[PDB]
């Protein structure tokens, strides 16, 4: 419920999950990462869309079953004097696999000769500094984009909505929800047993 207190959004569309039904399901393994986008490539943070940006820096996997949250930022980190806080990787040797945080300082080469620290030649720096000013409308504008990942690994659910639980009922064919496992049937006492670790 704290999501809606963060201005009108250019986001909240989701793939593989229902944004309207965010309280009934229960799961675990929640990971969240934060970055910024220019604004003209907001839709580039999506499975199946591959270009230059979000391909050499952070490639979203096809099997991600998650979505992002974002809104316009004209008073948070946009200054008239400029904001040089954020950078991104211009050049990479090959395509970057998903969920790999990489650091690079060495000079990217564009020829057959060796190149590690030589400037003024066809080798170029693989990074550049952002320039954020209000004179750019959509092309150069900071955004409050945060990616959220949902993992459906076989584990007991830990984090979900604060909805209260009801009393146990027996010998009735009803619908049950046990840590996000929706099922229908009649509940009976279990004569079966196993080692108490599952």
């Amino acid at each position: 419920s704290v999501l809606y207190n963060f201005a009108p959004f250019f986001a909240f569309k989701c793939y593989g999950v229902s944004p309207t039904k965010l309280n009934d399901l229960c799961f675990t393994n929640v990971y969240a990462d934060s970055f910024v986008i220019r604004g003209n490539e907001v839709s580039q943070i999506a499975p199946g869309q591959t270009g230059n940006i979000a391909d050499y820096n952070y490639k979203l996997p096809d099997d991600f079953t998650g979505c992002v949250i974002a809104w316009n930022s004209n008073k948070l980190d946009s200054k008239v004097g400029g904001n040089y806080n954020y950078r991104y990787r211009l050049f990479r040797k090959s395509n970057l696999k998903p969920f790999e945080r990489d650091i690079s300082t060495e000079i990217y080469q564009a020829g057959n000769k060796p190149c590690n620290g030589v400037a003024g030649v066809n080798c170029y720096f693989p990074l550049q500094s952002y320039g954020f000013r209000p004179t750019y409308g959509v092309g150069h504008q900071p955004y409050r984009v945060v990616v959220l990942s949902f993992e459906l690994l076989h584990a007991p659910a830990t984090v979900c909505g604060p909805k209260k639980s009801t009393n146990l009922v027996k010998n009735k064919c009803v619908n049950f929800n046990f840590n996000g496992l929706t099922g229908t049937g009649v509940l009976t006492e279990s004569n079966k047993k196993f080692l108490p670790f599952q």
Epitope: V80, G82, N85, G117
Partner: antibody, heavy 126, light 109 residues
Framework: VQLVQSGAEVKKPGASVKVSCKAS????????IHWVRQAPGQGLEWMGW????????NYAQSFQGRVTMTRDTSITTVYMELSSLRSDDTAVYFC????????????????????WGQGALVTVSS | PVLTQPPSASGPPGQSVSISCSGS????????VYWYQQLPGAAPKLLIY???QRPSGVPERFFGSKSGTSASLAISGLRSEDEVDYYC???????????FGAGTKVTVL
């Protein structure tokens, strides 16, 4: 516009001197500021960078504990102090300032002193 | 530390005077070097930034380019702007900050 610095005159060694850098015109919350000293007969020498909206402090690898600066966002000025002055560390001080705002070490590749502010050359003598 | 720069560089007008700036691999080649000049009793002014572009009000005879481990500056004609000392601005990781030159005293002949 240009920046100012309230320097001092010739002073005895082993004392404390306080200067004040006051902004003028623009709202002093978006420009990263620097400091520099230029010895007579020598070149400029870098000291550090601070931002007058957050608690980020950095120094060079020669004056880590020698200097200590204070920031006042509401008062809208920046002080720094020199303690236990020797005969060689005294130099002319300019309140440097670079365009843009960032607080990372890798950001300094694209950070340069686009504009310069005037200062003063306080000195030391016994 | 400070970079090795020749302080005694001069020449008659009509020819080219070259001033070089020696530095380490982390200072020159992996970082963008800058060129600045200053007057006695006056604030320094920007002449060459990023070694590719020149700002407004700067004469086009100024030139600063990088080609290896040591940058250099070349000037053509010494009439009014090359009678004052210059500086070599660069950034490295030797002190977690920027470096400056020792001053190149250039006179008029």
């Amino acid at each position: 516009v240009q920046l100012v610095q309230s320097g001092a005159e010739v002073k005895k060694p082993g004392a404390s001197v306080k200067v004040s850098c006051k902004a003028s015109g623009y709202i002093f919350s978006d420009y990263n500021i620097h400091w520099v000293r230029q010895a007579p007969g020598q070149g400029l020498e870098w000291m550090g960078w601070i931002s007058p909206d957050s608690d980020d402090t950095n120094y060079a690898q020669s004056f880590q504990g020698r200097v200590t600066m204070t920031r006042d966002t509401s008062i809208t000025t920046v002080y720094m102090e020199l303690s236990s002055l020797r005969s060689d560390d005294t130099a002319v001080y300019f309140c440097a300032r670079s365009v843009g705002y960032c607080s990372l070490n890798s950001c300094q590749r694209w950070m340069w002193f686009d504009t310069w502010g005037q200062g003063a050359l306080v000195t030391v003598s016994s | 530390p400070v970079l090795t720069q020749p302080p005694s560089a001069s020449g008659p007008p009509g020819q080219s005077v070259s001033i070089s700036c020696s530095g380490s691999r982390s200072n020159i080649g992996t970082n963008f070097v800058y060129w600045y000049q200053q007057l006695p009793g006056a604030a320094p002014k920007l002449l060459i930034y990023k070694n590719d572009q020149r700002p407004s009000g700067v004469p086009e005879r100024f030139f600063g380019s990088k080609s290896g481990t040591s940058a250099s500056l070349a000037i053509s004609g010494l009439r009014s702007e090359d009678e004052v000392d210059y500086y070599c601005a660069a950034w490295d990781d030797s002190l977690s900050g920027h470096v400056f030159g020792a001053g190149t005293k250039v006179t008029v002949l």
